[PDB]
Amino acid sequence: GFFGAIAGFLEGGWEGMIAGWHGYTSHGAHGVAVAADLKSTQEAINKITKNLNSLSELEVKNLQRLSGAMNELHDEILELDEKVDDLRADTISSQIELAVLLSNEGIINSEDEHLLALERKLKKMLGPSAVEIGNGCFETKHKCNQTCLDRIAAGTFNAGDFSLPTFD
Amino acid sequence: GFFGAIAGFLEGGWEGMIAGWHGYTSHGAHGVAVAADLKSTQEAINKITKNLNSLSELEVKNLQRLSGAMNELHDEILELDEKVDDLRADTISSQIELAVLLSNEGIINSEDEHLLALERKLKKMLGPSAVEIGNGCFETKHKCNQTCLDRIAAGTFNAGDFSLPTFD
Amino acid sequence: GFFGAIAGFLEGGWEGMIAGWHGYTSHGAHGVAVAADLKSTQEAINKITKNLNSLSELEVKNLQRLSGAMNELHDEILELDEKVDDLRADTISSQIELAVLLSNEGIINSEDEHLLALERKLKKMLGPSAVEIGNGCFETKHKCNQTCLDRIAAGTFNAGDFSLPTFD
Amino acid sequence: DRICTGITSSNSPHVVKTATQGEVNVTGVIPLTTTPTRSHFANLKGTQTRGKLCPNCFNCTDLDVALGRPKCMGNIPSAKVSILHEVKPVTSGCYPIMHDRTKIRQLPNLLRGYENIRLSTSNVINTETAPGGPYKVGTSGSCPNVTNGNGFFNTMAWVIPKDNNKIAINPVTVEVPYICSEGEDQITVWGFHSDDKTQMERLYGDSNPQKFTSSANGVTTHYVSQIGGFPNQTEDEGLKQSGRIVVDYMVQKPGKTGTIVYQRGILLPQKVWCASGRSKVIKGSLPLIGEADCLHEKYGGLNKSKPYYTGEHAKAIGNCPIWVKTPLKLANGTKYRPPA
Amino acid sequence: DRICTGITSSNSPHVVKTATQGEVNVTGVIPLTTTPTRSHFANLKGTQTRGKLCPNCFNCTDLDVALGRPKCMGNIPSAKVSILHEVKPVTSGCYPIMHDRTKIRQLPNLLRGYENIRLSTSNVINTETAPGGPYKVGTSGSCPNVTNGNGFFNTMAWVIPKDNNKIAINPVTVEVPYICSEGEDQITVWGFHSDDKTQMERLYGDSNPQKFTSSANGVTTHYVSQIGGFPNQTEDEGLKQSGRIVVDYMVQKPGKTGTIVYQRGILLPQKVWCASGRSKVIKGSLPLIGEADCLHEKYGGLNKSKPYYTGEHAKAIGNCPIWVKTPLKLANGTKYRPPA
Amino acid sequence: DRICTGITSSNSPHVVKTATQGEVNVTGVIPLTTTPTRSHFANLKGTQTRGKLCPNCFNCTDLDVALGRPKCMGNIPSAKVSILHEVKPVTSGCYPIMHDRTKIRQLPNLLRGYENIRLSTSNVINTETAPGGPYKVGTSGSCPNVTNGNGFFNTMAWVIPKDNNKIAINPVTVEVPYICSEGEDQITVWGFHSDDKTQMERLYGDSNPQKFTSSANGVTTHYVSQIGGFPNQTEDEGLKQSGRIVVDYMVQKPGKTGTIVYQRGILLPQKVWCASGRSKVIKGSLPLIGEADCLHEKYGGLNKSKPYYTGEHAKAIGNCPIWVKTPLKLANGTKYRPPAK
Numbered sequence A, B, C: 001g002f003f004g005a006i007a008g009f010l011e012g013g014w015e016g017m018i019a020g021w022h023g024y025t026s027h028g029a030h031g032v033a034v035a036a037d038l039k040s041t042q043e044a045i046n047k048i049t050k051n052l053n054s055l056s057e058l059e060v061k062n063l064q065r066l067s068g069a070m071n072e073l074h075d076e077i078l079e080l081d082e083k084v085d086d087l088r089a090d091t092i093s094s095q096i097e098l099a100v101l102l103s104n105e106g107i108i109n110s111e112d113e114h115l116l117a118l119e120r121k122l123k124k125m126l127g128p129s130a131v132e133i134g135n136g137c138f139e140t141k142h143k144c145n146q147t148c149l150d151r152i153a154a155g156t157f158n159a160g161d162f163s164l165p166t167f168d
Numbered sequence D, E: 001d002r003i004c005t006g007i008t009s010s011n012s013p014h015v016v017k018t019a020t021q022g023e024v025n026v027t028g029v030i031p032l033t034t035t036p037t038r039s040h041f042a043n044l045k046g047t048q049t050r051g052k053l054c055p056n057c058f059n060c061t062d063l064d065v066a067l068g069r070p071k072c073m074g075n076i077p078s079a080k081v082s083i084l085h086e087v088k089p090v091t092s093g094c095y096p097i098m099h100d101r102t103k104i105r106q107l108p109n110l111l112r113g114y115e116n117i118r119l120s121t122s123n124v125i126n127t128e129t130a131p132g133g134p135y136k137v138g139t140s141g142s143c144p145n146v147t148n149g150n151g152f153f154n155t156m157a158w159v160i161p162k163d164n165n166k167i168a169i170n171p172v173t174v175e176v177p178y179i180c181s182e183g184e185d186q187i188t189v190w191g192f193h194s195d196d197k198t199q200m201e202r203l204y205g206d207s208n209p210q211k212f213t214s215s216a217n218g219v220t221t222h223y224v225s226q227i228g229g230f231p232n233q234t235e236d237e238g239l240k241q242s243g244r245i246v247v248d249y250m251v252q253k254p255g256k257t258g259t260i261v262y263q264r265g266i267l268l269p270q271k272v273w274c275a276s277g278r279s280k281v282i283k284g285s286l287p288l289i290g291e292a293d294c295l296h297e298k299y300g301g302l303n304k305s306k307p308y309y310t311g312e313h314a315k316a317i318g319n320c321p322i323w324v325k326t327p328l329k330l331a332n333g334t335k336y337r338p339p340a
Numbered sequence F: 001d002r003i004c005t006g007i008t009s010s011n012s013p014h015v016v017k018t019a020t021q022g023e024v025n026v027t028g029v030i031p032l033t034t035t036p037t038r039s040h041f042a043n044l045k046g047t048q049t050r051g052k053l054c055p056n057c058f059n060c061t062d063l064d065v066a067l068g069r070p071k072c073m074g075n076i077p078s079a080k081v082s083i084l085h086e087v088k089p090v091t092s093g094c095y096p097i098m099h100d101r102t103k104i105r106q107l108p109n110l111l112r113g114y115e116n117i118r119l120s121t122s123n124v125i126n127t128e129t130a131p132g133g134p135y136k137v138g139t140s141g142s143c144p145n146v147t148n149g150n151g152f153f154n155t156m157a158w159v160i161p162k163d164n165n166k167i168a169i170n171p172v173t174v175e176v177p178y179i180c181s182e183g184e185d186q187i188t189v190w191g192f193h194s195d196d197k198t199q200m201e202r203l204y205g206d207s208n209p210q211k212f213t214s215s216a217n218g219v220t221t222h223y224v225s226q227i228g229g230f231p232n233q234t235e236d237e238g239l240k241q242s243g244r245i246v247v248d249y250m251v252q253k254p255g256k257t258g259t260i261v262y263q264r265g266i267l268l269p270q271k272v273w274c275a276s277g278r279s280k281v282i283k284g285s286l287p288l289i290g291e292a293d294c295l296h297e298k299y300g301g302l303n304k305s306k307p308y309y310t311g312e313h314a315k316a317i318g319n320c321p322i323w324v325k326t327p328l329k330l331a332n333g334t335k336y337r338p339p340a341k
């Protein structure tokens, strides 16, 4: 979003990320590794699922016929009744449109916030010997091939596996 | 929230924090010290208080009787008037419910953002000799018991009080 | 906002920042330099413009006269029609008032988020030799006068211009 | 090495609107609307649904039942939901009525608006003490009863002056008492018979136009009869008749009396309708086939899936999708990114 | 050591709904609603509140005052807010009326719908030039005036044909002129007296049913009188009478005249109501006890605290809480966390 | 050196409301509303706008045309939008009417509610077979026709009893058939003539008050005529007359018949109105000057700029700004900051 654009986050995307919406990439001698973070993707999906349930909870009164107003006899009243129904449908429609707009706004805008959280998951595992660049990337002393990246996504990566220090 | 879940923030809570909603903890030889951040607590309450005032500012037109429509004579009209009132109440109720939902959305979702802000308050005071982990915690070279933590919450903590460097 | 207040971000403002809403300052032997970030300002302006277009997209049904209800003859019906119009205007106005409130809420609250993104733009250019304080400031080894600051705002600043290391 | 945080990139054909980024493409969406398809109408799930007023009254229209046509008396089941299947209800038997001269057609549509509908068991007016000399009770071959003898609408009494009473009268006034129970509305059915000059003379001893005036709840209705030269018989039994009746109804709110001022040819009210509660009513058609979550005037039977729907808005009852102006979509993915 | 940022953990019995996290427990909430309790009605704070039409008219019902019953004339104070305390208003004196044969009962409820209400000081029809031969003005013991002499409703004139004029008449037409001031609505009260055959002949020289027709603003109303055999006297003075009057009202918009076509027994309009502005009206009961921010049809007098309220929605005027379906709560704490 | 992130500080005269910070000053706002100014009414952009029912019928009012006054029939254009410029329409010719004794004044305003309006070409009642003895068709100098001969309202027939029919009658009933086309509403105009005792005798052979009753769609209307002593002629042709007519209308929905019960003086319906569709109607004034995006009952012609507007809410049609309670502003800047110390 606008954060990433100013922060200099990568504006492009990775086709290799298929098992998730968000995750990590790694650049070294192996080339470019790509892994999806299932935890971040699930959180995004759970938020959307809760949002869907929230939108689906809305109840509005049925619009039926007036019981007293008879056809032909009470046509003028029935015209007003038609108008009341029409305006109800109109007003609630725009209100729902607003509620959905704000919902989609939140979801799309939360993308960069997922990345920022993914920064913290990555940072801790990489240990004190890694260097935070700031654009959403970290510079490591060790090699990090596709196999290394997968352990990061799964949250099992240890810094001691490269003789580097960990947060105790 | 979703940020903390991905970032690996502590999902639990501290019963010892009774004077505030958010704050700091310290883990060492002293055991576990706990102090509440009043600055952060006031801010959260002030947002909610302003939010209450905003919700309380809403005015809608009174619903009274029609002046012209007489009982018995105009019952068919009065039924429609009854319908208009019902739909007004229904529609505005749902609008207010939406407004309150978004308010609660904001308040509950701002929890992690308070934590993220508390990171910056802690980081500056702890000085350059501390190591930022990323999970909302800092590792210090020094001991920090309850007396030390109270000074952190109160914003008086100095790194020089442990002969450690400060941000100049 | 509430973030900056807790994070210890500067609550004041810089009158010298005239070409933009957000940006950077520099404190050294030169005194206090000030530069505006056009990228951050443009993003903020673009979001508002999109918000304006969204608010301007709303259409609601016209309120006209009933075709059947005749003056004098159907005055009681016409009074209810008057009431329907009045309540429609009332309800939609408050809905729009809510929509504008939420828009302005987002805009004003996103200020600190621009700053946080500006941190990441600044951090990368300053290189690994700079020290992140946490209060939105970085400590540099080099002098950074008004000329230096303009290169930062324009995103052209290199750390190699002081023989300091860069993030490649 | 350099490890970074990244977002996927896939085909993004779906579009949603945002507040601060305009329309954006997305990798996935959850659909919130559908355009329903027209179906047969049905019973509202979890609610007895009224179609015909009297289900066990075979070969009887609702208007037949409402007027108390012989052979068309039965149980009127209570219903919290009713289908208006006749915009202009018709009769299918009994004595020829000139329907469009009153509001009578809407009577069964008026009734179905109530939850509970019952016909009174006692008469509201005693014909043997009713104003306007002594009467005998007339019947017709047009209205054969359950044993096929000559009869008449059970809601009314075709009173005929006795042979020694064939004389004109000034307009006399009868009070229609409220005989219904606590809270019930009373619907009083009444009218008048008219004929050609000859039959008028034979039946009533007067061939001048007769005048009828009703009053209830501030509503007054005035009628003047027609002597001969009637429009053709329609919606009746098919038995040729020289005369025509005009039928009207009169709404009496709880504890309220009504008045009928009448001359010769009067059809005095007998059995009256007693109705209470409110029934939810929408336009629809018969028969009701199956069960549904929601009844919709344009789409008929309809089951709820998506929370919203698009298409033709109309009156709808039950567990329904909420109408929306456009096909809304909830984002279930990420804003489109070109491949790196 | 390790210094961290943390969130408290306390008892969290309260629940609020969120968009992206469903229902969540919290340590504290601010209640936004209350369920009000029923109280006596009251004066609306900052607004003069009408109960009875004429406060200084003692022993008078609103309908009494509206009909111009003797002893029941006084100042009708203006009010922007009125309480409808009689859904079906009653009389408590004067000549026996057959109320339910017209819309007359609602007359004072029609009046209270206006902000300003006054009775005209001049008569709208001069009885000495009124169509239908020469008249004298009749009075009754049922309607004793302020000095306990025989009188009548001041809104009407019981005109009687002179002794040399006791004869039947064809329906004659009188124009009711608009005599109210700029912007005011005129409400014309009129009617007709009827009796048994003997008294009708003595009083009018005709014992046939009389016919009356009014027309104003496109509304036409027709009545036919009843000769003897009346319903029992009610809501009147208690003095036995052989006759009954029927009373109706007629609304004339600014500068618009109405017509009354009448025969014998006519009660010609005299003093008329002149009304302007609109008064906000809700149902309620008397007396008004104290002061309140808000009058609610179900809860009566009510002061505003919480911005919203739950319970029975109904018509309500003043500084009121807005009705909502559920007890909404604003979060004032943190989402529940288990102890570490 | 120490490099920091900072926010500007400028003049902040504009104020907007927030959810969590109350009212805050800002450096700039985008106004979302304006208070419109009153203007002349105009044609609605992209839609033909009806004013007078008959634009080319000069010296004819809408009520004149609706009653079928001679000289006042012309092309009646269809319109999806109509301006109600007469709250209480008046006549300007033909035989003197006592308007306020019926609902007749509103008749042309009823018509303009329809998109399509036409007068029938055939008569709805045959005067030569109408109940109540034999009739001739009467005319007046008050109603000069297209060839400048004496005539009458084309919507009605002033039937006079033949010389062998100058006698009182019992109330007779005529059925008014539905003669309009698919989907059309029929609006039947009728009434009755009355006069002083002398003229009544000459014209009708009865000087007693006459009674008339209409019935259609459950609506019954009863009238009793007046014999002499009429109010003065008004809104008519100007020729002095001893008699007055009362005119009423009767709405017949598709396939619906109406009845008229009548005695002497009856004005039998002839040509009837056939109307279909719906026209959007608001109050306004004539003439229509120019073109506009939106027609507003208080502001007349109005072009849309800001998405919303403040001021007097009223009925409005076309491309209109949405009414709001307060002058809303969208924030286009930053929350006020004091100069940094």
Ligand SMILES: *[C@@H]1O[C@H](CO)[C@@H](O[C@@H]2O[C@H](CO)[C@@H](O[C@@H]3O[C@H](CO)[C@@H](O)[C@H](O)[C@@H]3O)[C@H](O)[C@H]2NC(C)=O)[C@H](O)[C@H]1NC(C)=O
Binding pocket: F145, F146, F147, F148, F149, F150, F151
């Ligand atoms: C415009 O009005 C004039 C009358 O001012 C209409 O012309 C006139 O029509 C009447 C009736 O048709 C004629 O009167 C007589 O009718 C009897 C009927 O049997 C007939 O036998 C007589 O020979 C005589 O025609 C009258 O002569 C005739 N002309 C005039 C100058 O009055 C004229 O028809 C009206 N315009 C239109 C377009 O109809």
Ligand SMILES: *[C@@H]1O[C@H](CO)[C@@H](O[C@@H]2O[C@H](CO)[C@@H](O)[C@H](O)[C@H]2NC(C)=O)[C@H](O)[C@H]1NC(C)=O
Binding pocket: A041, A042, A045, A049, D028, D030, D332, D333
């Ligand atoms: C929304 O999220 C994705 C859209 O890409 C849908 O796909 C699911 O993704 C989860 C991954 O956490 C896995 O269960 C499967 O890959 C998918 N689930 C199924 C049942 O196929 C997901 O289904 C969508 N959810 C909703 C509620 O629409």
Ligand SMILES: *[C@@H]1O[C@H](CO)[C@@H](O[C@@H]2O[C@H](CO)[C@@H](O)[C@H](O)[C@H]2NC(C)=O)[C@H](O)[C@H]1NC(C)=O
Binding pocket: D011, D012, D013, D014, D015, D025, D336
């Ligand atoms: C974003 O979505 C739009 C609409 O789905 C895409 O535009 C469509 O492209 C297809 C090509 O297969 C055309 O047939 C449609 O006519 C286009 N729609 C419109 C409204 O122009 C667009 O290509 C998508 N963008 C991306 C980057 O995938």
Ligand SMILES: *[C@@H]1O[C@H](CO)[C@@H](O[C@@H]2O[C@H](CO)[C@@H](O)[C@H](O)[C@H]2NC(C)=O)[C@H](O)[C@H]1NC(C)=O
Binding pocket: D139, D145, D146, D147, D148, D149, D150, D151
């Ligand atoms: C149905 O049939 C006839 C209607 O004519 C009824 O039986 C007649 O009732 C009269 C009443 O005085 C008596 O003369 C006889 O009992 C019958 N007369 C003839 C000529 O048959 C019968 O009561 C009607 N109603 C029912 C059966 O419920």
Ligand SMILES: *[C@@H]1O[C@H](CO)[C@@H](O[C@@H]2O[C@H](CO)[C@@H](O)[C@H](O)[C@H]2NC(C)=O)[C@H](O)[C@H]1NC(C)=O
Binding pocket: D039, D290, D291, D292, D293, D301, D302, D303
């Ligand atoms: C809506 O409700 C249910 C959906 O479960 C349908 O009712 C069942 O439909 C099946 C198939 O036609 C039939 O066996 C019965 O009509 C119902 N099942 C049982 C066991 O009784 C109903 O038809 C649905 N209608 C629509 C229009 O979707």
Ligand SMILES: *[C@@H]1O[C@H](CO)[C@@H](O[C@@H]2O[C@H](CO)[C@@H](O)[C@H](O)[C@H]2NC(C)=O)[C@H](O)[C@H]1NC(C)=O
Binding pocket: E011, E012, E013, E014, E015, E025, E336
């Ligand atoms: C969250 O709040 C709910 C609702 O107050 C709590 O559930 C209640 O628990 C008490 C005691 O067990 C019961 O008496 C109530 O009947 C429950 N209410 C409902 C609606 O289930 C729940 O215990 C709270 N959770 C926590 C962790 O405090």
Ligand SMILES: *[C@@H]1O[C@H](CO)[C@@H](O[C@@H]2O[C@H](CO)[C@@H](O)[C@H](O)[C@H]2NC(C)=O)[C@H](O)[C@H]1NC(C)=O
Binding pocket: E139, E145, E146, E147, E148, E149, E150, E151
């Ligand atoms: C109340 O009582 C009688 C009406 O019956 C009125 O008495 C009349 O007063 C006038 C005064 O000019 C005398 O000329 C009449 O002779 C009196 N009539 C009778 C029968 O006594 C009395 O004035 C009324 N008072 C009012 C209306 O204020």
Ligand SMILES: *[C@@H]1O[C@H](CO)[C@@H](O[C@@H]2O[C@H](CO)[C@@H](O)[C@H](O)[C@H]2NC(C)=O)[C@H](O)[C@H]1NC(C)=O
Binding pocket: E229, E230, E231, E232
């Ligand atoms: C009104 O009271 C009268 C006596 O004050 C009652 O007298 C009734 O009059 C009718 C007229 O023919 C007769 O049937 C009886 O004399 C009475 N009827 C009854 C049913 O008892 C009368 O009951 C009361 N109610 C009215 C007239 O409606």
Ligand SMILES: *[C@@H]1O[C@H](CO)[C@@H](O[C@@H]2O[C@H](CO)[C@@H](O)[C@H](O)[C@H]2NC(C)=O)[C@H](O)[C@H]1NC(C)=O
Binding pocket: E039, E290, E291, E292, E293, E301, E302, E303
């Ligand atoms: C609403 O508030 C008003 C204002 O306080 C109350 O009126 C006061 O009531 C107290 C006792 O209840 C008296 O001692 C005061 O003299 C009253 N003051 C005024 C100005 O009237 C009123 O009772 C409250 N009513 C309700 C229903 O809450």
Ligand SMILES: *[C@@H]1O[C@H](CO)[C@@H](O[C@@H]2O[C@H](CO)[C@@H](O)[C@H](O)[C@H]2NC(C)=O)[C@H](O)[C@H]1NC(C)=O
Binding pocket: B018, B019, B020, B045, B049, B052, E028, E030, E332, E333
């Ligand atoms: C929201 O809750 C907070 C506490 O969670 C309230 O703040 C407390 O209020 C008490 C007395 O009202 C005072 O001791 C302090 O202001 C707070 N105490 C503690 C221990 O935090 C606050 O008043 C509530 N807000 C509203 C609007 O009710």
Ligand SMILES: *[C@@H]1O[C@H](CO)[C@@H](O[C@@H]2O[C@H](CO)[C@@H](O)[C@H](O)[C@H]2NC(C)=O)[C@H](O)[C@H]1NC(C)=O
Binding pocket: F011, F012, F013, F014, F015, F025, F336
């Ligand atoms: C923020 O609010 C208002 C903007 O309307 C400023 O004060 C107003 O405008 C001028 C100030 O010179 C004076 O009329 C009053 O002080 C205010 N008027 C009204 C009607 O409120 C206020 O100064 C602004 N604050 C800043 C820092 O710019």
Ligand SMILES: *[C@@H]1O[C@H](CO)[C@@H](O[C@@H]2O[C@H](CO)[C@@H](O)[C@H](O)[C@H]2NC(C)=O)[C@H](O)[C@H]1NC(C)=O
Binding pocket: F039, F290, F291, F292, F293, F301, F302, F303
């Ligand atoms: C509304 O806009 C229309 C067109 O945008 C205006 O009509 C124009 O008026 C100008 C000046 O009188 C002429 O030069 C143009 O030729 C007109 N164009 C058309 C298409 O008519 C109209 O005057 C505007 N009205 C208001 C009230 O703003």
Ligand SMILES: *[C@@H]1O[C@H](CO)[C@@H](O[C@@H]2O[C@H](CO)[C@@H](O)[C@H](O)[C@H]2NC(C)=O)[C@H](O)[C@H]1NC(C)=O
Binding pocket: C019, C041, C042, C045, C049, C052, F028, F030, F332, F333
């Ligand atoms: C919002 O305000 C900004 C500036 O505060 C407007 O953008 C500037 O407009 C001026 C002239 O109005 C130009 O000279 C600048 O080049 C614009 N861009 C800047 C200063 O970055 C912007 O137009 C306003 N938004 C809207 C919708 O009008």
Ligand SMILES: *[C@@H]1O[C@H](CO)[C@@H](O)[C@H](O)[C@H]1NC(C)=O
Binding pocket: A143, A145, A146, A147
């Ligand atoms: C990384 O993968 C490559 C695959 O060829 C290989 O060097 C090895 O499996 C991994 N290297 C390390 C250091 O784990």
Ligand SMILES: *[C@@H]1O[C@H](CO)[C@@H](O)[C@H](O)[C@H]1NC(C)=O
Binding pocket: B030, B145, B146, B147, B148
């Ligand atoms: C904490 O640190 C200082 C050390 O002098 C002092 O406050 C205290 O002795 C220590 N221990 C505790 C439990 O406060």
Ligand SMILES: *[C@@H]1O[C@H](CO)[C@@H](O)[C@H](O)[C@H]1NC(C)=O
Binding pocket: C030, C145, C146, C147, C148
């Ligand atoms: C800033 O930088 C250069 C020196 O590196 C030179 O222009 C001068 O010292 C400074 N100029 C200003 C305007 O501050």
